[PDB]
């Protein structure tokens, strides 16, 4: 367990592989963006080795499948993905010696394949059904998924599906949550994050509510891509997400993605609301680097 049972000293010793770079990310105080009262802190998930939080779930999905004997040594892995999850799976399979094949729609920007290809993935571009270059439809995605399912059947590969695999949320129950609890020294009044798979929210919140049943956990929802609509939740507009993505860069020096701006907008709404206790500590997630975007 590179993320939990580790004697690796990243600061003062040798890091054995990129797997040991995943997790144990910094918890940064955003004290210039939010000068009080109460405190805003956020996990620096853009400092994972592929620059998103997906490294955590990618490591868990593969490591757990190896541990159970389902994924054999040097067995092929396949995924349909144009996003962060594919970068994470490419990284972990590169280190662990698994051949990796990715399918995605030809409608994607070629930018979406660069990191996966650089990490050894065999990227297969699948013809569009209904969409056109830069407009990838539901039907275009379904055609990519069908190609991946057919290749998996023909090659007897291990299929990765972060929406359907139970170990996806386990990653954050075992790592993200326990790290926030330790880094805050047990001072946290609220946790919030947006939901794609829901793994980060569900796993992290489950752990935090075991340590402090009083902690308030909120799903960050778009008002109406990555994060999706539907317990307790905070809505943020695209305009607000863009606004706080900018403010995070200008006041804290951190260039993160769109979902990060939504998370920061929501956290600031919560801090301004007066719904929490005096001097409340609020934690959210800096999900990925702004560099990961076309």
Ligand X SMILES: *Cc1c(COP(=O)(O)O)cnc(C)c1O
Rule CB under 6 A: which residues touch ligand X?
52, 54, 83-84, 194-201, 226-227, 257, 259, 287-288
288 binds, among ligand X, its own copies, none (CB under 5 to 8 A by kind): ligand X
Rounded to a whole number of angstroms, the minimum distance from the CB of residue 128 to its own copies is 25
Please, what is the minimum distance in Å from the beta carbon of residue 221 to its own copies?
A: 24
Give how many residues touch its own copies by CB under 8 A.
53
Min CB(278)–ligand X separation in Å: 31
Q: Which two tokens stand for residue 20?
A: 């040991």
Instruction: Name the phi and psi angles at 117, rounded to 5.
Output: -60, -45
* Crossing angle (nearest 10°) for helices 111-118 and 84-96: 10
CB 276 within 8 A of CB 216: yes
Residue choice 71, 77, 78, 119 for contact with its own copies (CB under 8 A): 119
Site for its own copies in 229-258 (CB under 8 A): 245-246, 249-255
Regarding 40 and contact with its own copies (CB under 8 A), the answer is: no
Q: Which two tokens stand for residue 147?
A: 């190609």
Among 183, 205, 259, 284, binds its own copies (CB under 8 A): 183
Q: Is 268 helix (H, G, I), strand (E, B) or coil?
A: helix
Residue 224 CA, chain-centre distance (Å), reads 21
Q: Which residues pair with 185 in a beta bridge?
A: none
List Cβ neighbours of 139 (8 Å cut-off, separation of 6 or more). Answer: 129, 130, 131
Length of the chain: 294
Element (H, E) at 80: strand 77-80
User: Among 215, 208, 216, 199, which residue's Cα sits nearest to residue 161?
Assistant: 199
Contacts (Cβ under 8 Å, ≥6 apart) of 254: 28, 44, 46, 248, 286
| Contact status: 206 vs its own copies (CB under 8 A) | no
Written as six digits, the tokens of 174 are 């075992």
- Assess 99 for contact with its own copies (CB under 8 A): no
Residue 92 contacts its own copies per CB under 8 A: yes
CB of 251 to its own copies, least distance (A): 7
156 annotated ligand binder: no
Task: Find out whether 287 is annotated in a ligand binding site.
Answer: yes
Query: How far apart (Å, rounded) are the C-alpha atoms in residues 44 and 161?
Result: 25
Binding-site residue ranges for pyridoxal 5'-phosphate: 84, 196-198, 200, 259, 287
Binding-site residue ranges: 84, 196-198, 200, 259, 287
Provide the binding-site residues for its own copies, judged by CB under 8 A.
10-21, 24, 26-29, 31-32, 41, 44, 47, 49-51, 90-92, 94-95, 97, 114-115, 118-120, 182-185, 245-246, 249-255, 289-292
């Amino acid at each position: 367990q590179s993320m939990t049972e580790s004697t690796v000293d990243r600061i003062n010793g040798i890091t054995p592989s990129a797997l040991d770079l995943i997790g144990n990310t910094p918890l940064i105080a955003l004290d210039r963006l939010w000068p009080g009262p109460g405190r805003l802190l956020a996990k620096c998930e853009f400092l994972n080795p592929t620059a998103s939080l997906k490294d955590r779930s990618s490591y868990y999905m593969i490591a757990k499948a190896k541990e159970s004997g389902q994924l054999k040594d040097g067995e092929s892995v396949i995924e349909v993905t144009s996003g962060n999850q594919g970068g994470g799976i490419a990284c972990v399979t590169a280190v662990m010696g698994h051949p990796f094949t990715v399918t995605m729609s030809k409608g994607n920007s070629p930018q979406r394949a660069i990191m996966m290809n650089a990490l050894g993935a065999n990227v297969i571009l699948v013809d569009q059904v209904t969409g056109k270059p830069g407009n990838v439809t539901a039907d275009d995605v379904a055609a990519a998924e069908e190609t991946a399912m057919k290749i998996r059947e023909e090659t007897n590969a291990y299929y990765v599906d972060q929406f359907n695999n139970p170990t996806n949320c386990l990653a954050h129950y075992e790592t993200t949550g326990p790290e926030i609890w330790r880094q805050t020294n047990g001072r946290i009044d609220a946790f919030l994050v947006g939901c794609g798979t829901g793994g980060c929210f569900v796993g992290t919140s489950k752990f935090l509510k075991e340590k402090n049943p009083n902690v308030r956990c909120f799903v960050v929802e778009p008002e109406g891509p990555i994060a999706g609509c539907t317990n307790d939740s905070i809505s943020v507009s695209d305009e607000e997400a863009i606004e706080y993505r900018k403010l995070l860069g200008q006041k804290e020096g951190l260039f993160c993605g769109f979902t990060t701006g939504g998370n920061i907008a929501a956290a600031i709404k919560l801090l301004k609301s007066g719904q929490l206790p005096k001097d409340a500590w609020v934690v959210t997630i800096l999900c990925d680097s702004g560099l990961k975007y076309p």
